[PDB]
Write a protein that binds this ligand. Sequence first.
Ligand SMILES: CCCCCCCCCCCCC/C=C/[C@H](O)[C@H](N)CO
Ligand SMILES: CCCCCCCCCCCCC/C=C/[C@H](O)[C@H](N)CO
Lengths: 49, 242, 242, 48, 249, 49, 92, 49, 293, 293
Amino acid sequence: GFPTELKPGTNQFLTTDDGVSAPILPNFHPTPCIHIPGEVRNLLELCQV
Amino acid sequence: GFPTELKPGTNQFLTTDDGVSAPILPNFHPTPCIHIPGEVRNLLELCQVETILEVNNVPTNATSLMERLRFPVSAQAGKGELCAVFRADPGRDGPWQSTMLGQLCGYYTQWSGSLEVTFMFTGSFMATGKMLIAYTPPGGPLPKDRATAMLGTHVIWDFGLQSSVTLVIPWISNTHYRAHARDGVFDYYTTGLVSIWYQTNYVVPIGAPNTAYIIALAAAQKNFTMKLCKDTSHILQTASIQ
Amino acid sequence: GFPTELKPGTNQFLTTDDGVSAPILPNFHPTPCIHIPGEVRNLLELCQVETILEVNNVPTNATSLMERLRFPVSAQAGKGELCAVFRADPGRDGPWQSTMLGQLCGYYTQWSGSLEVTFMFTGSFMATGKMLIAYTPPGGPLPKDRATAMLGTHVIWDFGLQSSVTLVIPWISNTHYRAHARDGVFDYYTTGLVSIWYQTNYVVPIGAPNTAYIIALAAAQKNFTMKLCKDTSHILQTASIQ
Amino acid sequence: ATAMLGTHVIWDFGLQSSVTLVIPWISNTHYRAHARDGVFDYYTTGLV
Amino acid sequence: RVADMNTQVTSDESMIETRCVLNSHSTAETTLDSFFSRAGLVGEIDLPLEGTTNPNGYANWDIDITGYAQMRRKVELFTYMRFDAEFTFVACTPTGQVVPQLLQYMFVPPGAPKPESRESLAWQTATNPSVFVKLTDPPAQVSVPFMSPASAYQWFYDGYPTFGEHKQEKDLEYGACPNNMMGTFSVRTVGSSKSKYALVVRIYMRMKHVRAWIPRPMRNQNYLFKANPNYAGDSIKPTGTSRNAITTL
Amino acid sequence: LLQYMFVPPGAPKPESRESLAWQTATNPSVFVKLTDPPAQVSVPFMSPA
Amino acid sequence: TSDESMIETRCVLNSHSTAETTLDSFFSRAGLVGEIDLPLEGTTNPNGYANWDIDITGYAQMRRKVELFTYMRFDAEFTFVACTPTGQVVPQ
Amino acid sequence: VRIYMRMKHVRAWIPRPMRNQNYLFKANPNYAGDSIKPTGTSRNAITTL
Amino acid sequence: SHENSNSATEGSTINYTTINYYKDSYAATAGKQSAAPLKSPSAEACGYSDRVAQLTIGNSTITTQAAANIIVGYGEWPSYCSDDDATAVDKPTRPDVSVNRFYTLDTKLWEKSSKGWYWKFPDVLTETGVFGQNAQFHYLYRSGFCIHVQCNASKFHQGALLVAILPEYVIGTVAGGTGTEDSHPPYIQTQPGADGFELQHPYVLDAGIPISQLTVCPHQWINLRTNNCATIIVPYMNTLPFDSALNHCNFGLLVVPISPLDFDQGATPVIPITITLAPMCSEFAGLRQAVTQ
Amino acid sequence: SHENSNSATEGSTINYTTINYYKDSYAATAGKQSAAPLKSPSAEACGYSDRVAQLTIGNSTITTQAAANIIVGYGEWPSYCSDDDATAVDKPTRPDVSVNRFYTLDTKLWEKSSKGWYWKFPDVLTETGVFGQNAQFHYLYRSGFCIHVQCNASKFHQGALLVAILPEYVIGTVAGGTGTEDSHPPYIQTQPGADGFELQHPYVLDAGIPISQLTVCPHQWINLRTNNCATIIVPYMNTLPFDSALNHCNFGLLVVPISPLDFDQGATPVIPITITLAPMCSEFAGLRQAVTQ
Ligand SMILES: CCCCCCCCCCCCC/C=C/[C@H](O)[C@H](N)CO
Ligand SMILES: CCCCCCCCCCCCC/C=C/[C@H](O)[C@H](N)CO
């Protein structure tokens, strides 16, 4: 048992929190990404149209 | 006390979660593994084994359940008659459920790759003839005649000389993987239809039986791959185990 | 707050869990360990010590409880008579419970390896004779005669010259480890039966006692190994400790 | 079942029209005298 | 003195004309460690208040994962099967309520005394592996090793455990390999008096480091009895759906 | 105590609360109490496309 | 006698670990060594306090386990599972 | 309050015979003298099992 | 070095990358994994054409088409138990010419309405031959098998047999038909000896497993227009290096007609199926008195 | 370096790999562990044939068969306390010729119905000899022992004795028979002196421990057809470097007949068992006035 203190914010669900969650499907490799034209990688690209 | 925040997902039990749990038996070394022949290390090895395909899944009673494993071939009028049809979807509820490819496909949502369907002739040595085994890619309905069927992927099978041909159902789909085709919206993922037609006839002399049988063995090729493991629905139990 | 997910198994108390707990006494150094002779560092060292085997576990009253540690040998009619039988399972409820091998086997589910059963003759110096101590591998029932018994693993014991022989029960099993044999399905894990037969006789002159005794000492060899530690059932208490 | 315990061959005569059954030299003596119905049946080769 | 002591330009090539296909299709999800490392319900233990099943607050569940059709059919694809198991016990009220009740799971290996009561002395668990956990706590998860005396677990044992003549009274011993029965899984409510909550202990088991050897035909009949391939003979159903005719779909 | 269960296409949808599909021997399922924080799982890209 | 002077033997590769028969394997398993009753109306400990003399020879399983030896030096992992006599987990 | 105790870093020295009698009193090898039971089960005869 | 190497995958040829916060390897995660034996490989496919050029085992010779249409079970030739796999310390006896030879069991007749038969091994060879005497006399038994099922029919006969080797072929019952009886098969059904036992429900193999999926197991076809014999060289498979030959059947040989036998009137109606099996690399340990069962 | 070296296995010869998140080593996990002394080794087996060639201790000589049938307790010869083990700062006296010598206690008669006797050490030597005077005069005592139990019988006599050394032989009672009395043994039972005490229930050794399992302790056999004497060289065992010789018995010498004494009428019915014990490497510290107990 490693000594540990829980700070404020445990068991909270921040909707914009970027965290690591348990994968539902172990060793699931997704369908390979074929090349689709027109890929968007930033919304400022859309804003410039 | 190391500072720590608990994220969403604590005290949850994900059944497929791969985690580290407390060992019940400290310093327990298991019985050493002796060499046992035939070890399986991937289910695609099982999927690549030819297994009897129940094309003739017409009989239902237990007396004639053995008739499901083979379908009849006999002398015809020589008009390009239809022998047997079946869908080429391994995961579909139908002829392929008798196959290990079908049963293992029931445990996976998506499948991809080509399929081997070996048709073996179990007539007499004096029984000669040819069959056109046609695999229709999706979109084409059940062919009305052999001329409609030969436009698809097909093989011509001399069963007089070669007693067993394999019809490779090639992987031809829009999607990279196929979900299990069903009677509805999910028929988008159909593999197509495999139909066997009398290319010439079933020819026998006097003394040979007028009706023979073909045993369809179905499998998958090396390019086959299953994905997204799921609970099977090929068999369902409404009762508990006593 | 380091992000963290609690898996299944938090706030559980596994009794055999090997973990790190908060020390009650900070900077407490214990009393230095003086050298004490005879230190035990493995229970298989205890299992390798010869310990009196209660082959004659017939008497029950406390007056004749000392008669359990030895079994009689006496002059016979010279027809290959049976002296004593017992099962060769150390963990079985029977003769082996008096042995430290039996008691330590009670704390482990699986055992493997050969067993030493030393039979020591405690008759007179003028008492001569031979005994056939036969260990029957599993499958063979209790032998009806000595001819049935000598087909198994056996030793012939001159107790006139050598006052103590050891019958090695060799490790002969289908499984790599043996669970504790019981009267039922678990008799699959039987070691077999060890039977002592009069090879010639018990011969004494006038002035020597007509009945002697053999003290069976049971142990295990260097290849012995116990597995899967469990609660013992050789002794059970239905009452609390006052 | 009694016969297959000895030296035997299994002969598909549908495919191979002629098999040879080798009677191996199995005797106590180095040479065999001619077996007869009597004492000299000691020198029997056996039965095929 | 004796001297006798990826498709490119039946692999799709001999049947059709093919193009080159770069098959970046992983096979990692069809492994045993992917197909079998998913926890499934292998045991449910009822500890009711007035029922006659386990009215004394204790239960001795014999470890037999062939009690539920899904995982039984999954593992029974093979005969010989060696793995370590991740055992999870989700205790709850039969109404699903999470009640403040403390339970004692106890692994009782063969030979160890099965508790005869809730206040049995076997619950001291001085050598037996036991778990103390509340229902308000998350489900108790323990790593169970490969404990068989054999080199693999054996869901199909074509034979008998004991010797001797096998009559009809001993016919139930057929198929019962004692390399597979690993004692009982004992649950109690930790206390002298009867627990005030009806309790249900659901055992979910996930196998890790899986090795399986001999593939058999799957189970196409309805399971009826645990550790028994018995089937309803008068209601044998086909492996799949039927057709009105063979020339139609 | 609730049981979330991901039922991929082809897997049997449970017809009742005490359905045998809840044994989740292959389906990814989450066991969690309401007193616990919200159950968070990482779901991969599962599309055949 | 090492199986050689009694029978004819084959070569057996004994990959059988002895690590589970050690004291750190046979004894590092938590067993019930004490039960303390704090009832509401009973005369055992009616005042809400109890003084349990440390004596692990009160329960037969662990007492027989440790009494296999006389002299025995160890560090102990002590766990106290407090509960209602009905097993209830009360906010106390 | 149930006390469960697990011993670590164990060193033990002198093995004695185990306890084949029912324990009666703590820190006391006292046994029921009028009900001394054998170390194990009994047999109706020694030539049989 | 800080953890016990005591997971269920130790000694295997695959490295598993894992996560472990505990002392035992079996506590770790499932992790990652850092011709075909199951497809009934032939002797040509197994690279064992040197051992199959003419099949003479013991004082017995079978004349059959070799190599191409001869199946080695699970891609594994039978072999003697190694020192690592074996646990019994006594040295086993290896007769190898008196027990490793082709035994001809019986001549079961194939009919048009025939359902099929199964033979349990080595229960078929329990009470005949030196192999039978060694199995009765020794507790421990280990051997491979070379099953040569023979069924000769004319070129005007038709039909195919699924000659398959089903390991641990546990026999189930009808459970009273309604499935609410918990019946168990008798001893003569589970271990039918050399004469075998006819399948009551060959579709489920009297075990609830489909006959269609039997070909993952080492199998052969006796399609009469092509071959009249089926040679399956079968290794020893068990969770154990050795086992009792009297109360454990390592495998069951299924011989059922998938395609029914048919012929015109005038042809010989007696089409017999003859079972021939040669134990391979037989090993008997744990000698005692002989026991029938 | 960051943690105290204060676990119970510090100073031992085995490295324990462990996990510790705390300041103290005893807080860590149990971890891993990175002829035979308990089998009553002989002097030949212990490599101590040079010290046993002729057993003359002090001004006393016993004539007995040496080496092979002479047992060193726990594979450990008695030795003087080292500086590391000893805690008492005063230098102890080591008479070594007046106290290290064979003392002959008594001549208990072995009968056909005899149950057995036990002698508690050094309570047997508390009130006789210079060893007795040193034990009475000094608080601290440390010595090994060379117990030579002697029982001579003719070649027509039979019977065997379990001469065993039971360390910390705590005497229990019948607890009133019903087990509901909490009785304690008297002083004359716990420390019976040189004349010893007869076992009331030799099966449980008057302690609830079986006589059968006594052979893990340093033991010997006086099987009369083979040997008439039992020499057990016994080291000093205690949790302490020294102890009081008047209120702590380090071990108890069990001499019970496992095989009953039997002989025909005419032979001498008086078969006596004589106990001889030589303290080895005796160490007395903490000198004060002499106290009997
Ligand atoms: C603290 C809880 C520990 C739980 C320990 C569970 C032991 C796991 C053993 C699983 C191995 C298979 C058990 C039995 C197999 C089958 O159900 C039948 N016996 C064979 O049909
Ligand atoms: C915060 C709680 C700390 C608990 C401290 C417990 C101390 C552990 C000492 C255990 C050592 C043995 C205790 C007594 C031994 C026996 O029961 C008898 N005295 C001897 O028969």
